[PDB]
Write a structure and sequence with these properties.
monomer, 108 residues, Oxidized Rhodanese, domain 1, three-stranded parallel sheet, 8% strand, thiosulfate-cyanide sulfurtransferase activity, cell membrane, EC 2.8.1.1, transmembrane helix, cell inner membrane
Length: 108
């Protein structure tokens, strides 16, 4: 189930149900955000693990910017998987790839 997907086709699923996690940091969420994602850095994952609220049949993973999700898809898998998991191509860079502005606004 571990695979990558463009931010183009992802921009849909995400707006369909695809639950994306923020296996990066918290500070990030502050400044920038992402196309549908809830705070949940690998630091919390190891401290807890794939949450329920974000346990939708299908979910996705990302990061600040590095695309090192597949590099650790081993654990993340045993964390999320077999729950249909994926990767937004590149860490954030993807969402931006297509040229989509993140939730860079407090309160909104």
């Amino acid at each position: 189930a571990l695979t990558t997907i463009s931010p183009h086709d992802a921009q849909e699923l995400i707006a369909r149900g695809a639950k994306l996690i923020d296996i990066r940091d918290a500070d990030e969420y502050l400044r920038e955000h992402i196309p549908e994602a809830d705070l949940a850095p690998l630091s919390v994952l190891e401290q807890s693990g794939l949450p329920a609220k974000l346990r939708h049949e299908q979910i996705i993973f990302h990061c600040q910017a590095g695309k090192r999700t597949s590099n650790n898809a081993d654990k993340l898998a045993a964390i999320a998987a077999p729950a249909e998991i994926f990767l937004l191509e590149d860490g954030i860079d993807g969402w931006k790839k297509a040229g989509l502005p993140v939730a860079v606004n407090k309160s909104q």
